Homo-oligomer: A and B are copies of this chain.
C-alpha cells in the first residue's frame, strides 16, 4: 500500500467518499455520495427483518418488514437514498456502499442475525431469524447473534465489474390530458425473463354457481422492484355453450399482501370448437410498485349466462406466459440481497439505520448544464490490487456483514497510512 488506493479506500470504507471504478468502462461521469438515514420503530413481537439490496444501482436501498404475532411479516416502508437520484441524473453506476443497523432508543435489547444471499428475495428458502444463518455456506457472508446495542455493519462487495451504466427511472419530457400521467425511461439493459407454462391442455371441470367458480391456475415466485411487463397468451377450448371467463393477474409482495392487481380479460365469451385467445399485454410502471414483488399468480373465473343446478362447466387451456422485469439481471438490481433480522428487541424502541452509497453518475439534460463530467482518475494497479484483495478475501476477513465493533477495528487496522503529504510544500 503506497499511501492508499482511492478505490480500495472507498470499497472497504464507503463512508469515506466515492471513487471511480478502475475497470474498462470509460465514461465521462461525476462522483457523488448519498446518505441514508432511518429510525425504524419496533413492532409488538419485538422482531423484524430488513431487506437490503447492497448492489442496487440507484436510490432504492432496501425495505423494512415487521414480524407479527401470527408469524407473517408486514411491510413497513422502503429504505431509500437521501434524495431521489432519477430526479437529477439519468445514468448511474454503483461504486461502494455500507450501512449500519443498531438500536438507539429504549422505552439490553435483543440480538441480530444477518446474511448475504446470492440471489433475489423470492429465491430464499428460509427467511426466519434463525433460518437465515444457512442461506450461504460462506462464513464471511453471515454473522450471528450480535447485540443490537452494538450494531451490525453491512458492506457491499462487488458482483462483477465492467458493468454498463444503468439508466435510472428518470422522468422524460411529456405532456398529457391526465394529471396523473407518468413517463419515464427505465432500467432496461440486462433484463430478466421468467417463462411460465401455465397450462398444457389442462382440463377444467366444475358445476355451475351464481357468480362463477374461481380458481388459481398457477402461482410462481418472481422478483421485481422496478417496472416489469407480462406477455404471452392462453388458448381456451370448450364444448359447452355460453361460458364467460374472467382473468386477473396478481403481483404479491413479500408480506403476502397484494401489491398490484390487473384484470387481463373481463367478461370474455367462449365459442365452441374454436381456439379462444386470451392475450397478455401488461406493462407495470415503477411508481405502481409499492413494495418488492415476490410472487405472481393468475386467477380465472368461469361463469355461465344461463345456469341451472348441475350444468357442469368445462374448458381446456394451453399456453405460456413471459414475465420480463426490466433490468432484472443487471448484477445488483435484484441479485445480491443482504438480510438483517432482529429479535427480542423491546417494543417501541428505535432501530437506527445509517449508511452511505457512492455512485458514478451522469446528470440529466438540465443539470448537465452546470455539472462537469470527466473520465476516471487514472491509477494503474488499482484493479489488480482490488483483485488481489478480493482473492484473499477469506484470509483477510473481509465480510459483507460485520459486527460493528469488528468493522471499526478493521477501519483502523487498515488505512494505517494517511501521511498528509510528503515534502511537496518544501519541494521548491
Say whether A118 faces chain B, with CB atoms less than 8 Å apart: yes
In the assembled complex, the Cα of A138 lies from the Cα of B367 at a distance in Å of: 12
Chain B nearest Cβ from A399, distance in angstroms: 11
Inter-chain contact A106/B104, CB cutoff 8 Å = no
Q: Which chain A residues in 373-393 approach chain B with CB under 8 Å?
A: 373-378, 380-381, 383-393
A218 CB contacts on chain B under 8 angstroms: 174-178, 181, 183
Partner of A145, one of B354, B380, B385, B426: B354
Chain B nearest Cβ from A424, distance in angstroms: 7
Would you call the interface of chain A mostly helix, strand, loop, or mixed?
Answer: mixed
Chain B nearest Cβ from A341, distance in angstroms: 11
> Which stretch (A62-70, A123-131, A303-311) binds chain B?
A123-131
Q: Which chain A residues in 399-416 approach chain B with CB under 8 Å?
A: 409, 412-413
Partner of A172, one of B23, B220, B352, B409: B220
Chain B nearest Cβ from A355, distance in angstroms: 9
Chain B nearest Cβ from A204, distance in angstroms: 8
Partner of A317, one of B111, B178, B188: B178
Task: List 11 interface pairs A-B (beta carbons < 8 Å), by A numbering.
Answer: A23-B162, A25-B160, A88-B370, A138-B374, A145-B354, A169-B195, A172-B222, A175-B218, A186-B194, A189-B191, A265-B277
Inter-chain contact A26/B164, CB cutoff 8 Å = no
Q: Which chain A residues in 106-138 approach chain B with CB under 8 Å?
A: 106, 108-111, 113, 117-119, 122-125, 130, 133-138
| Copies of this subunit | 4
Inter-chain contact B365/A123, CB cutoff 8 Å = yes
- A193 closest partner in B (C-beta): B188
Inter-chain contact B109/A108, CB cutoff 8 Å = no
Chain B nearest Cβ from A305, distance in angstroms: 14
Partner of A25, one of B161, B184, B362: B161
A117 CB contacts on chain B under 8 angstroms: 365, 368
- Give the number of chain A interface residues (Cβ < 8 Å): 187
Inter-chain contact A388/B37, CB cutoff 8 Å = no
Say whether A72 faces chain B, with CB atoms less than 8 Å apart: no
Partner of A362, one of B113, B118, B373: B118
Known: A104-B111, A125-B369. Is A157-B28 also a contact (CB below 8 A)? yes
Say whether A280 faces chain B, with CB atoms less than 8 Å apart: yes
Inter-chain contact A123/B371, CB cutoff 8 Å = no
Inter-chain contact A167/B192, CB cutoff 8 Å = yes
Inter-chain contact B195/A183, CB cutoff 8 Å = yes
Inter-chain contact A352/B111, CB cutoff 8 Å = yes
Inter-chain contact A380/B425, CB cutoff 8 Å = yes
In the assembled complex, the Cα of A291 lies from the Cα of B365 at a distance in Å of: 22
Inter-chain contact A192/B185, CB cutoff 8 Å = yes
A23 CB contacts on chain B under 8 angstroms: 24, 162
